[PDB]
Amino acid sequence: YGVIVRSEGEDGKLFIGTAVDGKQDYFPTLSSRKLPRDPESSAMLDYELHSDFVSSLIKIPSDTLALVSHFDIFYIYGFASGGFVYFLTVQPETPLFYTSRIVRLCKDDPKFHSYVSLPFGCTRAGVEYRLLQAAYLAKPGEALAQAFNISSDEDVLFAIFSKGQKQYHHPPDDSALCAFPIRAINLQIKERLQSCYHGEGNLELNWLLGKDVQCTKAPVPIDDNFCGLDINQPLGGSTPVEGLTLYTTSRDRLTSVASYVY
């Protein structure tokens, strides 16, 4: 999946998330590339930032591929909202089980220090739907805006989830439609950031870090638009973002979603 970002005045950039086919050294799993207005630009699709040690990209570690046969990360959807871009992924759980996650980056963060990734899903009646199938960004409508305590023109992510965390290739029919206000996603991330910058626990992102890494306590104010530093990143988390389940079925599997307000 990809997301183009270009404001008035900016030349432009393209965020791409992709499976890498076990060729982790050929292809970044997520990165930012230049997308200049001039089609003839000598910089077209170059990395936004390329340095010996710091580039605008994430690579899957060899270690992870070694731990899980045919490990890969699938990018189901992606969108921009406010000052951030978001990617929704499915991948094997590092020691089968799959984990569906929300990945957030600041729009303006060539070093990728803002990387944060949290699992997400929803539940209803003892049933957990934790395997992402499809998603779509839209407005809430009056009822949902009330339920979420947000304004009418704030963004909401609608998503389809299959039951459980197993059987990615052959999902049961049991599936659900779920809604996540962008506001709650951002809030839960900010709180994760604040907890981490207070020195509580670890980064909890084994697949990318390859080991337990402690959160660093530091005198840094975290606001709604915090864009990271070279400490406490990339940032993970074990506690899921829960969505509001809207509809469930056990009969005919849900495969797609779009939405608007009338």
Partner: protein
């Protein structure tokens, strides 16, 4: 399990407090502030003391008083902005300074110097004569650590800088790296724990066509089962030019490593796995060797050992079979030679079978792919004599630093080894000639009176420089550097019994003074020493 031998002589703090100490004073003398010494090195005839904000120089040859004085001082402090950034990121105030962690002779007129620079590693060139910098400051990333407490390796060979450290503030990306020297930069494969798994870098030596790196790391051999640390040696080809467009571009094409075997063999072998220190290559008994100190893990009953390794046995391990894991669930096994590509992985371009290859860039893909996935050798390097030369398992501290005089005695043919420790205790033994060892001396050299000030009492020996020409072993602590005589010969005064029983290569009874003195290869005088035994047959 073998018991700890007793030393022939013991020098208590009572005695050694008379050894000259450096604490950073110029001649003339006032409250002392901790020096935060990082390392020491002798080059030419100058002793360099790398520390926080400074490098102090000592004129080894003209030092002749109770206090060792500073001759000249390099000053390099971090800009306030860097300090602020460092504090802002949560590092303690005491950490956010410029600690000098790299000091190397670049050429006859130039010192290469790197400092942690408040967690923003930076490198500079200095004129040797004036100790002033010339040219611009430049990146210390991958060349110098961020954290003064971290261990690191830095070494020049043919103008190229070999370094081992971490590249990132968080110290996740440990690396073995090469830059400068009008050659391509190369690094170990990032995030590949088969290449490196949380390594602690100890030493590098330049030997033959290779650089050898000594370190410890988590052993993938013990993946299944628990976390275990193994000691390693690793080779890289000095002429490495990196891989092709398709494989190991910008990475080593010659990186291989192997377990070092330091053990007391038995019903079950007892390994000392935690590598503490390694010497430079030393010629001993016609062989090129290094000596290394190993300890048991910090979560275990404490023990230390000294093993020696022949550079030929090291070279040898890298000609043997590679290790592999036939599956994420199987044990590590040797790869059959039939499955090893040609040219052989780890052999340098322009070698015997490889004259066809002008550089590593032209290596075939099956070779590059194989070494990228098999950096580890199957066998462990045997130690000389296949057991430790020296053991300490009855003390609470660990052996750490090591220095060697391979030309001790009237006839410059004895091998004496000096061992530092965490408690400021120096150990001295003679290497029998290469089997075994004799425990000559244990001494407490830490000097509370000179070294315990500004609230710091840290007895950890941070470096030792043995200097034959001045007859001394210079011993660095965090707050002070001590000048220790190689021998305590004249100490025995006119007691021949004690002198002879010392069995110390440096010492002998001179029949012209009726006294015990240190012997020099220039002495035409007649001496008496019985080293092969200490036969007294009194009394003093």
């Amino acid at each position: 399990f073998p018991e700890d031998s007793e030393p022939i002589s013991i020098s208590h703090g009572n005695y050694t407090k008379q050894y000259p100490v450096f604490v950073g004073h110029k001649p003339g003398r006032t409250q002392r502030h901790r020096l935060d010494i990082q390392m020491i090195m002798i080059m030419n005839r100058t002793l360099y003391v790398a520390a926080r904000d400074h490098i102090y120089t000592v004129d080894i040859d003209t030092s002749h008083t109770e206090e060792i004085y500073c001759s000249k001082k390099l000053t390099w402090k971090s800009r306030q902005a860097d300090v602020d950034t460092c504090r802002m990121k949560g590092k303690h105030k005491d950490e956010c300074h410029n600690f000098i962690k790299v000091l190397l002779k670049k050429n006859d007129d130039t010192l290469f110097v790197c400092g942690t620079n408040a967690f923003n590693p930076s490198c500079r060139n200095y004129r040797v004569d004036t100790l002033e910098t010339f040219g611009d400051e430049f990146s210390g990333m991958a060349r110098c650590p961020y954290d003064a407490k971290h261990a690191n390796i830095a070494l020049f060979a043919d103008g190229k800088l070999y370094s081992a450290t971490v590249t990132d503030f968080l110290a996740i990306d440990a690396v073995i790296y090469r830059s400068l020297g009008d050659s391509p930069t190369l690094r170990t494969v990032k995030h590949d724990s088969k290449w490196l798994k949380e390594p602690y870098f100890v030493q590098a030596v330049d030997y033959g066509d290779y650089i050898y790196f000594f370190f410890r790391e988590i052993a993938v051999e013990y993946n299944t089962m628990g976390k275990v640390v193994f000691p390693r040696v690793a080779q890289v080809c000095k002429n490495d030019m990196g891989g092709s467009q398709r494989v190991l571009e910008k990475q080593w094409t010659s990186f291989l490593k192997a377990r070092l075997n330091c053990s007391v063999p038995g019903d079950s072998h007892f390994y000392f796995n935690i590598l503490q220190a390694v010497t430079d290559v030393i010629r001993i008994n016609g062989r090129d060797v290094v000596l290394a100190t190993f300890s048991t893990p910090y979560n275990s009953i404490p023990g230390s050992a000294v093993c020696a390794y022949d550079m030929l046995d090291i070279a040898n391990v890298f000609t043997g079979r590679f290790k592999e894991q036939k599956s994420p669930d199987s044990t590590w096994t040797p790869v059959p030679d039939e499955r090893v590509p040609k040219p052989r992985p780890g052999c340098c371009a322009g070698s015997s079978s490889l004259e066809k290859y002008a550089t590593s860039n032209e290596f075939p893909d099956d070779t590059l792919n194989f070494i990228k996935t098999h950096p580890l050798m199957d066998e462990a390097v045997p130690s000389i004599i296949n057991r430790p030369w020296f053991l300490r398992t009855m003390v609470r501290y660990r052996l750490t630093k090591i220095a060697v005089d391979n030309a001790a005695g009237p006839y410059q043919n004895h091998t004496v080894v000096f061992l530092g420790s965490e408690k400021g205790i120096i150990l001295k033994f003679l290497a029998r000639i290469l089997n075994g060892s004799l425990f000559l001396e244990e001494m407490n050299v830490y000097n509370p009176e000179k070294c315990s000030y500004d609230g710091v009492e840290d007895k950890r020996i941070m470096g030792m420089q043995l200097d034959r020409a001045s007859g001394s072993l210079y011993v660095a602590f965090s707050t002070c550097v001590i000048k220790v005589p190689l021998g305590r010969c004249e100490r025995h005064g006119k007691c021949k019994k004690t002198c002879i029983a010392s069995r110390d290569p440096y010492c002998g009874w001179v029949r012209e003074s009726g006294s015990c003195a240190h012997l020099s290869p220039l002495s035409r005088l007649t001496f008496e020493q019985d080293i092969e035994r200490g036969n007294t047959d009194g009394d003093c």
